Each structure stands twice: as structure tokens, then as C-alpha cells.
Amino acid sequence: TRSSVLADALNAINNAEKTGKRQVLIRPSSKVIIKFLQVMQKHGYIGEFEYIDDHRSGKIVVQLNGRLNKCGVISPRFNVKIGDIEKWTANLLPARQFGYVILTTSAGIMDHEEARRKHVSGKILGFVY
Amino acid sequence: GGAKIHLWDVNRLKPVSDLSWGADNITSLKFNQNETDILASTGSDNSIVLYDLRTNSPTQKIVQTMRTNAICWNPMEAFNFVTANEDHNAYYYDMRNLSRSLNVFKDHVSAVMDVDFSPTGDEIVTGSYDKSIRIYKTNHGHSREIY
Amino acid sequence: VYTPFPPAQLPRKVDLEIESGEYFLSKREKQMKKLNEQKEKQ
Amino acid sequence: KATKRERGLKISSVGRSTRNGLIVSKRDIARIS
Amino acid sequence: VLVQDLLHPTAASEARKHKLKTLVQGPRSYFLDVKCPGCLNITTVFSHAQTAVTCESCSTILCTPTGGKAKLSEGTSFRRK
Amino acid sequence: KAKKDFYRFQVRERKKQEI
Amino acid sequence: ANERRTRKDMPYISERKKQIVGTVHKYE
Amino acid sequence: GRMHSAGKGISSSAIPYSRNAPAWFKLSSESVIEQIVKYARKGLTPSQIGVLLRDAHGVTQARVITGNKIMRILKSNGLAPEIPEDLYYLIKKAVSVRKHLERNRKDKDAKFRLILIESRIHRLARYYRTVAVLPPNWKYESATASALVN
Amino acid sequence: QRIQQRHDRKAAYEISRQEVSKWND
Amino acid sequence: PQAKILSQAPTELELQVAQAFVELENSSPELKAELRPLQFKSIREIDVAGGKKALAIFVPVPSLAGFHKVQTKLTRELEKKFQDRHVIFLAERRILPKPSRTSRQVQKRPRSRTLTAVHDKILEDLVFPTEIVGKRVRYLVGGNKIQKVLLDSKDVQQIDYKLESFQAVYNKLTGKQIVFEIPS
Amino acid sequence: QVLIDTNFINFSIQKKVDIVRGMMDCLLAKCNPLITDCVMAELEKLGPKYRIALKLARDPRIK
RNA sequence: AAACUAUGCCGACUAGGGAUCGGGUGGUGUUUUUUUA
Ligand SMILES: [Zn+2]
Ligand SMILES: [Zn+2]
Numbered sequence: 001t002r003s004s005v006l007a008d009a010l011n012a013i014n015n016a017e018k019t020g021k022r023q024v025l026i027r028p029s030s031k032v033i034i035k036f037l038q039v040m041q042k043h044g045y046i047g048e049f050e051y052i053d054d055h056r057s058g059k060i061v062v063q064l065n066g067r068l069n070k071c072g073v074i075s076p077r078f079n080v081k082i083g084d085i086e087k088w089t090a091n092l093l094p095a096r097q098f099g100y101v102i103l104t105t106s107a108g109i110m111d112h113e114e115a116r117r118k119h120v121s122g123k124i125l126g127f128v129y
Numbered sequence: 130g131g132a133k134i135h136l137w138d139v140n141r142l143k144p145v146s147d148l149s150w151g152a153d154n155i156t157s158l159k160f161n162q163n164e165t166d167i168l169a170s171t172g173s174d175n176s177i178v179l180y181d182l183r184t185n186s187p188t189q190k191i192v193q194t195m196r197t198n199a200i201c202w203n204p205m206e207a208f209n210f211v212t213a214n215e216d217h218n219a220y221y222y223d224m225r226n227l228s229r230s231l232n233v234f235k236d237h238v239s240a241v242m243d244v245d246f247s248p249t250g251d252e253i254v255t256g257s258y259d260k261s262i263r264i265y266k267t268n269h270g271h272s273r274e275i276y
Numbered sequence: 277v278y279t280p281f282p283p284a285q286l287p288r289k290v291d292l293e294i295e296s297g298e299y300f301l302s303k304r305e306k307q308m309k310k311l312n313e314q315k316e317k318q
Numbered sequence: 319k320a321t322k323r324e325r326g327l328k329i330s331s332v333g334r335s336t337r338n339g340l341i342v343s344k345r346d347i348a349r350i351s
Numbered sequence: 352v353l354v355q356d357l358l359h360p361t362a363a364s365e366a367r368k369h370k371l372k373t374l375v376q377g378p379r380s381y382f383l384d385v386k387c388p389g390c391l392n393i394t395t396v397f398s399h400a401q402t403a404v405t406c407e408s409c410s411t412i413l414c415t416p417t418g419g420k421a422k423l424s425e426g427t428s429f430r431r432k
Numbered sequence: 433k434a435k436k437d438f439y440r441f442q443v444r445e446r447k448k449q450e451i
Numbered sequence: 452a453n454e455r456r457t458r459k460d461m462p463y464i465s466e467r468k469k470q471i472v473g474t475v476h477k478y479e
Numbered sequence: 480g481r482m483h484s485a486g487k488g489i490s491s492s493a494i495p496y497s498r499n500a501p502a503w504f505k506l507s508s509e510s511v512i513e514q515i516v517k518y519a520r521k522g523l524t525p526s527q528i529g530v531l532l533r534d535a536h537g538v539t540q541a542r543v544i545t546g547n548k549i550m551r552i553l554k555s556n557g558l559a560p561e562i563p564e565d566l567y568y569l570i571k572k573a574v575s576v577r578k579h580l581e582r583n584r585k586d587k588d589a590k591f592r593l594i595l596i597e598s599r600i601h602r603l604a605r606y607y608r609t610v611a612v613l614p615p616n617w618k619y620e621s622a623t624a625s626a627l628v629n
Numbered sequence: 630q631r632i633q634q635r636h637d638r639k640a641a642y643e644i645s646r647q648e649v650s651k652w653n654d
Numbered sequence: 655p656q657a658k659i660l661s662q663a664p665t666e667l668e669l670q671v672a673q674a675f676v677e678l679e680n681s682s683p684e685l686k687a688e689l690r691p692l693q694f695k696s697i698r699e700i701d702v703a704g705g706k707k708a709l710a711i712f713v714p715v716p717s718l719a720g721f722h723k724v725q726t727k728l729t730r731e732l733e734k735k736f737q738d739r740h741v742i743f744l745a746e747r748r749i750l751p752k753p754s755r756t757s758r759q760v761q762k763r764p765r766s767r768t769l770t771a772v773h774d775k776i777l778e779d780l781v782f783p784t785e786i787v788g789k790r791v792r793y794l795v796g797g798n799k800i801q802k803v804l805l806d807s808k809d810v811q812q813i814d815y816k817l818e819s820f821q822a823v824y825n826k827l828t829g830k831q832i833v834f835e836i837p838s
Numbered sequence: 839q840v841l842i843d844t845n846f847i848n849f850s851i852q853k854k855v856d857i858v859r860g861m862m863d864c865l866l867a868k869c870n871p872l873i874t875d876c877v878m879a880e881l882e883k884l885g886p887k888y889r890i891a892l893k894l895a896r897d898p899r900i901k
Numbered sequence: 902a903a904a905c906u907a908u909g910c911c912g913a914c915u916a917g918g919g920a921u922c923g924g925g926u927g928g929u930g931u932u933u934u935u936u937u938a
Contacts, residue, residue, distance in 0.1 A: 003337050003338045003913085004338055004339075006339075007337065007338045007339045007913090008913090010339070011337075011339075011913065015913080015914070015915085016915085019914085019915055019916090020239065020258075020259075020915090021915085022215060022239075022240055022258065023356075023357055023358075024357075025357050034793075037793075038793060038797070041793065041795055042795070042797065047795070048173070048792065048793060048794050048795060049792075049793055050358055050790055050791070050792055051790065051791045051792075051793075052358075052374065052375065052788075052790065053788070053789045054375045054376060054496065055496075056376075059374075061357045061358050066258070069889065069890060070329075070330070072335075072339050072340060073338070073339035073340065074339060074340045074341075074342060075338045075339050075340060075341040075342070076341060076342055076344075076347075078342065078347055080351070081351070084350075084351045087350055087351070088350070090854070091331070091332060091350060091854065092330055092331075092332060093330070094329045094330075094851060094854075094890050094894070095851070095854075095856060095894055096856060098890075098893070098894070126339070126340075127330070127340075129329075129330075129890075131796075132794070132796075132798060151833075151835075152800065152833050153800070154794055163652065164648065164649065164652065167645065167649075173792075174359070175356070175359055175472070179645075181641055181644070181645050184641040184644055184645070186637065186638055186641050187638055187641075188476075188638060188641045188642040188645055189474070189475065189476050189638075189642055190474070190475040190476075191471060191473065191474050191475075192359075192472045192473045193470055193471060193472055194355065194356065194359075194361065194469075194470045194471075194472050195354070195355070195356045195470070196356075207649070207652045208649045208652060208653065214470075216354055216470060217354065218470070220470065224649060225646050225649060225650075226478075227474055228468070228471065228474055228478065229465075229467050229468050229471075230467045230468070230470070230471070231467070232467070233466065233467060233470070280580050280581075280584045280585070280590060281580070281590075282590055282593055282594050282597070284597065285597055285598055285601050287601075288605065290605065290609070291601075291605055291608075294605075294608050294609070294615055295615070295616075297615055299609075300611065300615070319910095320910095322910090323910090324887075326887045327848055327851065327852055327887060327888060327890065327891070328852060329851065329852065329890065331853075331854060336913080337913050359472075361472070370493055371489065371491075371493060375496065375788065376493045376494075377493050377494075377495055377496070378492070378493045378494070378495050379493075379926085382537055394535075395536065395537030396534060396535070396537075397533055397534045397537075400534035401530065401534065402530070402531070402534050402535075404534055404535055418924075418925070419924090419925050419926075420925085420926075421534075432503060433522075433523065433527070434521055434522025434523055435522055435523070435524055435567075436522060437627075437628070438522065438524060438560055438564070438567065439519070439522070439558055439560055439561075440557075440558070440559060440560065440561055441557075441558070442522070443561055454928090457928065457929055457930080458927095458928060458929080459928085459929085473838065476638070476639050476642050490924095496786070496787055496788070497785055497786070497787075498778075499778075499785075502783075630704050630705075630706065630815070630818065631814070631815065631817065631818055632814070632815060
């Protein structure tokens with residue numbers, strides 16, 4: 001039915017910020033959605049956002065300026081080494097220092113650059129550029 | 130302007146004095162052109178809050194139907210400003226009576242992300258998230274020219 | 277010939293495993309019972 | 319009208335970009351790793 | 352109608368939007384306290400009740416279900432609440 | 433209105449009346 | 452226009468006061 | 480989808496935010512308990528139990544008025560049903576339609592509907608056996624229909 | 630406490646209103 | 655009746671307030687029998703950053719329900735007893751751990767007694783007699799959250815001067831930061 | 839010294855070779871690239887869908 | 902026996918506009934009608 005919380009929430013952001021709306025509504029929320037969006041706002045791609053509750057599922061209202069270009073989710077959350085981190089970045093993003101790669105490690109959910117600073121790796125959620 | 134409006138000083142390495150109405154952020158400051166002791170700021174609870182400094186405290190708060198992105202005072206008149214406001218508008222306020230807007234300039238189609246006054250205290254430029262630029266002559270209140 | 281009565285729906289694989297009751301069995305019990313079934317069918 | 323909608327420049331080059339998001343085939347995983 | 356914030360809408364926007372598509376889904380029924388006249392009794396009925404609610408003492412009809420809002424019968428005196 | 437055979441006790445007395 | 456030719460006590464919210472939602476300090 | 484019928488409708492109850500009763504409620508928790516028990520002894524399904532208790536007595540919703548969902552109350556008081564009420568209603572509907580056909584052997588529309596009903600009833604039975612809340616060797620057949628409705 | 634803060638702020642507002650009224654003049 | 659009011663806890667402030675309860679009884683026509691079967695476990699004092707002071711009343715659940723029934727007037731008279739104070743009832747609800755990978759014969763801990771739902775009961779019970787209608791949490795760019803609690807407006811005036819004490823006491827009891835708001 | 843045309847930049851991005859290193863491993867010497875104001879203008883004119891390549895071309899090692 | 906001049910770029914889709922069909926709420930005056938249906 002509903003394909004995935006991650007897919008649909010991220011795709012809602014993408015649609016609205018290409019159509020031209022200042023702030024979007026998303027339902028539901030998730031630990032993972034929240035963590036992802038925190039990474040995005042940390043790097044600048046969006047602005048700031050509310051989490052609304054009704055006990056059924058958290059809604060989220062995200063004010064985004066215009067800085068996003070695209071950002072999304074990988075379906076097979078496969079496994080990647082460190083040399084493969086580098087090759088995967090260069091092979092996905094529009095260029096080398098352009099964007100970030102977003103991962104789940106046993107250490108936590110986090111971008112590929114500060115992942116490498118911690119000298120950790122793991123599986124791959126998505127990508128921002 | 131951050132979590133709470135800190136009034137800094139150049140010499141003192143620490144926030145000289147903190148100010149805030151309610152513990153929301155504050156997204157825009159601007160002082161005024163005369164009465165150099167009066168401050169105005171807008172914050173993410175859709176509010177315009179005026180502050181004094183020679184009295185050193187917030188003085189008034191208005192909550193609108195949608196946030197204001199940036200405000201500016203008119204260097205001829207010292208107590209009217211315009212507030213460029215995401216509901217696709219430029220709202221012209223007088224200070225004392227914040228129960229009514231002196232004007233409302235109304236001809237963009239997306240949010241208005243900055244605004245300013247021709248230092249001849251007559252003319253307004255409004256730049257919008259929609260890729261244009263208005264000028265308004267402050268006595269009418271529609272768009273006077275679009276770049 | 278016309279039948280007014282519709283034929284029953286063809287049961288599903290999970291239905292079949294519950295019918296065997298194997299679904300409620302643990303890993304080792306299920307594998308050994310599957311071995312028993314194959315051995316007796318053989 | 320009869321012109322074609324000027325297509326965006328097509329960037330993220332691994333696999334299929336669809337409803338669930340980006341699917342990278344196991345062929346592709348093995349190809350670049 | 353034209354443009355309104357996702358987060359801080361109006362009183363009008365709330366009480367005009369639907370009951371599931373408001374910012375926090377909520378109910379639109381309520382409760383009628385009513386005195387039945389046959390005994391001048393006090394009883395509570397669901398504002399949208401779907402049964403011919405009848406007071407315990409006076410076996411008298413209070414409201415007959417009519418689509419959405421439970422429709423009262425003549426001369427049964429209510430408040431809300 | 434009542435469903436005459438819904439509850440477990442109901443079906444027990446149904447067996448009773450069958451016997 | 453329709454809401455007004457039918458409804459009784461509808462105020463004319465002036466368009467220099469449509470978009471305000473509340474002051475804190477007050478007047479007379 | 481609103482399955483087997485293509486209308487995309489939505490129509491139901493909401494729930495207020497508060498996890499309590501409104502203060503103006505002043506009935507005994509135990510009192511509503513015996514009213515539940517008495518209506519159950521009279522012979523009403525849990526759905527109708529809830530309906531009566533939220534129409535007649537200002538009991539907003541039993542899940543919050545008491546500590547448990549109402550058939551958890553009925554299990555505490557020994558009155559769980561043999562089959563879930565929705566499955567029971569489906570059984571009743573299937574019996575109805577089958578006997579309808581048998582007297583009336585040409586209602587092909589009804590034949591179609593009976594296909595739909597048997598499909599859904601198989602689905603629900605499978606779910607209940609997955610929970611094992613219903614017996615695993617349990618089946619649907621016209622024999623169960625007759626011997627359980629009559 | 631909050632309410633004395635509130636009243637302090639109102640007094641401030643009166644002061645600022647006076648000053649700005651002379652700038653009106 | 656100080657020993658008849660305490661629950662294995664002789665402390666001087668507790669004895670003073672239990673004597674206050676005895677005064678409630680002996681000056682009260684019906685509250686004698688209204689509260690006589692009602693006891694508590696403990697009382698605690700908390701000062702506020704504003705310089706004022708407040709008190710918390712840890713009670714088991716059933717007598718807490720009794721206070722939910724009969725609270726407002728009791729708070730009135732206890733305030734008149736100890737002028738210049740704030741007062742709150744609370745429930746001592748136990749917490750239960752999560753069994754680890756190497757754990758003995760333990761029970762699957764309650765969703766209600768889990769770390770969250772308890773704190774939610776502290777929220778709602780603290781806020782009582784007025785009710786809660788929202789909970790927001792903002793995430794500003796600098797990784798700066800704000801938790802926020804949307805109350806109601808039925809009790810507006812008598813509560814508008816409780817909010818600071820509320821914030822402080824909840825900080826003292828949980829180490830959390832919460833901001834209270836009322837949509838007027 | 840190598841002049842860049844808007845279309846060459848679009849295809850370079852679209853096939854993921856970075857300007858400087860790519861030209862280096864093709865020509866096998868250094869390759870100072872040159873964008874003219876006209877090329878930059880055409881990129882910007884193409885506009886929002888091409889904002890990607892615009893950010894790549896505003897590069898402090900592209901003379 | 903049919904067939905025999907028909908053809909609109911498409912989709913995870915945004916704001917919609919009039920007119921209509923099926924319920925529902927609210928106002929509100931006309932038509933209605935009044936202890937009987
Ligand atoms: Zn009566
Ligand atoms: Zn040129």
C-alpha cells in the first residue's frame with residue numbers, strides 16, 4: 001500500500017520543493033525520518049520543522065527555503081565497505097564534494113563524510129545533493 | 130538574533146544583556162533610523178515584537194496569520210515600518226497602533242523575502258521568493274513596477 | 277451445465293502450513309518433521 | 319505544443335529511480351563492488 | 352481559503368476544515384443533557400445517537416436516529432454538556 | 433435484537449437443548 | 452456577498468485588519 | 480481502495496486528544512462494568528455494547544472509561560465469543576446469501592457477491608488462525624454454517 | 630514571576646509611545 | 655493523627671502538613687469522611703527560579719483519583735494554610751527495566767510503566783485540573799530542540815500564574831526542558 | 839588552454855567525469871580551462887534545472 | 902455479422918474554477934402546516 005514512510009516523506013519533500021512551496025506537511029513520522037531530516041537541516045538543505053502529535057503517528061511540518069536540489073532513499077539497504085563508500089559517492093552524486101551520502105552504522109545514522117572522520121561505515125539509506 | 134536576542138557589545142566578549150518575549154527563536158532584527166534606542170524583530174511564532182533599549186525590555190508583540198521575513202523602518206518618519214510577510218504581502222505598520230496596518234501592498238504571487246525603503250522615505254522595494262522585484266510608492270498600495 | 281454454487285477458493289501456502297500445524301513449530305522441530313514427511317513419502 | 323518538454327539533465331547514474339526510491343540491482347552492486 | 356499556515360491556522364480555518372483533515376483530527380459530536388418531561392429526569396445522550404433513547408423511569412422516547420445528528424422529539428428540554 | 437447464539441455460554445446451552 | 456445577504460451579524464473585517472491574529476498589550 | 484468496491488471513501492469516528500473522561504462524567508467505573516455485563520447476558524455483541532453505552536449513559540468510550548477494551552472486560556468476566564464478531568457476521572451473511580440463492584437459483588449478481596464474501600471470509604479466518612486465536616483445524620463449510628447458525 | 634514582568638513591559642510601552650509622539654509632532 | 659496519615663515516613667514538614675489535613679477535617683463539615691480513607695506516601699518541597707516555592711504530593715493511584723475528584727477546594731484551603739505557595743499532587747509510579755541479553759526470569763515490562771508513559775502521567779497530572787491539547791517539538795538548525803505543551807483555556811486566569819512553577823517543578827522531577835503555551 | 843562550451847559541461851556532468859582530472863588523463867598534461875562570460879550566461883539562462891552545473895562551473899580553479 | 906474517419910503526449914501531480922449527483926452540518930427567510938400523522 002503506502003510504499004514506505006521513508007520513501008513517501010522524502011518524496012513529498014522533493015515534490016513540494018520543486019513545485020515551489022515554502023513549507024510542507026508529512027504524515028507519518030519516524031525515528032528514522034526525524035534523524036534524516038536533522039542531518040539535512042544540519043547541512044543546510046532545509047530550514048526548520050515542527051513535529052506534531054496526535055498519538056496515531058507524528059505529523060511533521062518542514063519549512064524549506066530553496067537550497068534542496070534532490071534528496072532520496074535507496075531501496076536495497078545493502079552493505080558497503082570504505083573504498084566502496086568512496087566509489088559509491090563518486091558514482092551517485094553529481095560530483096565529488098557536491099552533496100552527501102547518508103548511512104546507518106552501528107555507531108548511528110550520519111553522513112558519509114563525518115562517518116569517515118569517525119572511521120566507520122555500514123549500510124546506505126539515501127543521498128542528498 | 131538566535132535562540133534569544135542577545136544585545137552584544139564590541140568590547141565585551143560575553144552577551145551584554147539578553148532579551149526575549151517567549152522562548153521561541155527570533156529570525157530577524159532591525160534597529161531604526163531615528164530613535165536609535167528602539168529595536169524591532171520578528172520570530173518564528175509569526176510575531177513582530179518591538180523592544181526598547183534605553184528601557185531595555187520588549188515592549189509589544191503582535192501575532193499575525195503568517196510569519197514575517199524581514200522588516201525595515203522609514204528613515205524619514207521614525208515610527209512606521211514595513212514587514213515583508215510570507216502571505217505574499219508587504220504590510221505597512223505604524224508603531225503605536227499595532228491593531229491596524231497602515232497599508233498592505235498586495236501583488237506578488239509567492240512569499241516576500243526582503244523589503245526596504247528608499248532613503249527618501251517614499252518608496253519601497255520588495256524582493257520575493259517568486260523571481261521578481263516590486264517597487265511601491267507608499268501612498269497607493271499596488272505594485273508600481275516589476276523587475 | 278450451469279451451477280449456481282461457486283467453487284471454493286483455492287487455499288494458500290500459509291493456509292497449508294497452518295493446516296500441517298508446522299507454522300507453530302520451532303526451527304529444529306519443523307526441519308526434523310519435514311525430514312520425517314519426506315522419509316515417509318519416500 | 320508539439321515540442322517535447324525539455325527534460326532535466328539526468329544525473330544520479332546507478333539504477334532505477336521509482337516510487338520506493340532508488341533501487342540498485344545486484345548486478346550493479348557486483349559491478350561496482 | 353487562499354493561503355494559510357500549516358502550523359498556526361485560524362479559529363475559522365479550524366472550524367471550517369473537515370473533521371479528519373484538520374491539523375489534529377478530532378470529534379464533531381457532543382452530548383445533550385436532557386430532562387425527560389414524563390418524570391422531569393436528567394439524562395445524557397450522545398449528540399449523534401443512533402437509538403430511540405428512552406428514559407429509565409418514564410418509558411418515553413427522547414431522540415430518534417435520523418442520519419447524522421440524533422433528532423430529538425418534541426418537548427424534551429436540553430442543554431449541551 | 434440480541435444475537436441468540438453469539439456467546440460461549442449461549443452455545444453451551446445450545447448443546448444442552450440439542451441433547 | 453452571499454454569506455452576507457443571508458447571515459445577520461457578520462462584521463466587515465477591514466482588509467487592514469484581516470491578517471492580524473493578536474496583540475498582547477492592549478488599548479482602550 | 481475500500482476493497483472489492485472501487486470507491487475511495489473515508490467515513491468514521493475520530494478520537495479527541497485527551498486520554499481521560501470529561502470531568503462532568505460522574506458514573507461508577509464498576510457501575511458501567513455491571514451494565515456491560517448485564518447487556519452481554521442479555522445477548523448483545525461488543526460493538527452494540529459500546530453503542531448503547533455511549534448513547535444512553537454519556538460514557539464517552541469504554542477503552543478510556545475503564546482500563547480495558549470491552550471484550551477484555553468480557554474475557555475477565557468469562558464472556559469471550561467462540562469466533563470474532565466480524566467473522567460471525569460474515570458467517571451470517573454467507574448463510575443468508577446461500578439460502579437466498581438456493582430458493583432463487585438465477586441471481587448471478589448474488590453468485591458474484593458470494594464469491595467476494597467467501598474470499599474475504601477466508602482471509603479473516605487465515606488471520607485468526609495466524610494469531611491462533613481460532614483453532615488451527617477450523618474450517619469454513621456450509622456444514623459449519625448450518626450447524627453454527629441453526 | 631511573569632505578571633510583574635508583563636506590567637513592567639506595558640509601562641515601557643507607554644514611555645516609548647510618548648517619545649515617538651514627539652517625533653510625530 | 656500524623657502516624658495515621660503518613661505512610662512509613664515521619665518527617666517534620668510531612669507531619670506539619672498532615673496536621674494541616676487534620677485541621678481540614680476538624681474545620682470541615684463533610685471533608686472529615688470525604689478524606690478520612692485517603693492517605694499519601696510523601697511530600698516534597700521545590701523552590702523556583704522566580705524565588706517562589708511549591709510542593710509535591712506523592713500518593714498511590716486510588717487516593718490520587720480521590721484527589722482528582724476533590725482537589726480544587728483542598729488546594730484552596732492548603733494555600734490559605736501555607737500562604738505564598740504552590741501545590742501539586744503526583745503519583746509514585748514504579749519503573750521497570752528492560753531485560754538485557756543476559757537476563758534471568760523477568761517479566762516483559764509494561765508499556766505503561768515504561769520510561770515514557772510514566773513521564774506523560776507526570777505531565778498530565780501536574781497540569782490538572784486544566785487539560786492538555788497538544789505537544790510540539792521544534793528542531794532548530796543548530797541542533798536545538800524545544801519541547802512544548804499546549805494546554806487549554808478553561809482555567810485561564812487562575813493558571814496563568816502557575817506556568818513558571820510548573821516548568822521549574824517538571825525540570826526538578828525529570829531533568830527535562832518544557833515550554834508551556836496556551837492558544838488564547 | 840581549453841575553452842568550455844555549455845553543452846560540453848552538461849555532457850561531462852551527465853557522464854560523471856570531473857573537468858580538471860578528466861582533461862588531465864585525456865591530454866596527459868595540465869589543462870587550464872576557460873569559461874567565457876557568454877558560456878556562463880548561457881548556463882544561467884538554461885536556469886533552474888541546470889543550477890547543478892552552474893554550481894559546478896563557478897569553480898575557483900576554472901579560470 | 903461486425904467493421905467503415907475516429908487520436909488525447911504520459912505519471913509517484915499543485916493550485917483550482919464554474920456546473921451537476923449522493924449523503925452531512927449551519928444559517929435563513931418563503932413554500933409548506935395547525936394534538937396528528
Ligand atoms: Zn421522566
Ligand atoms: Zn562571449
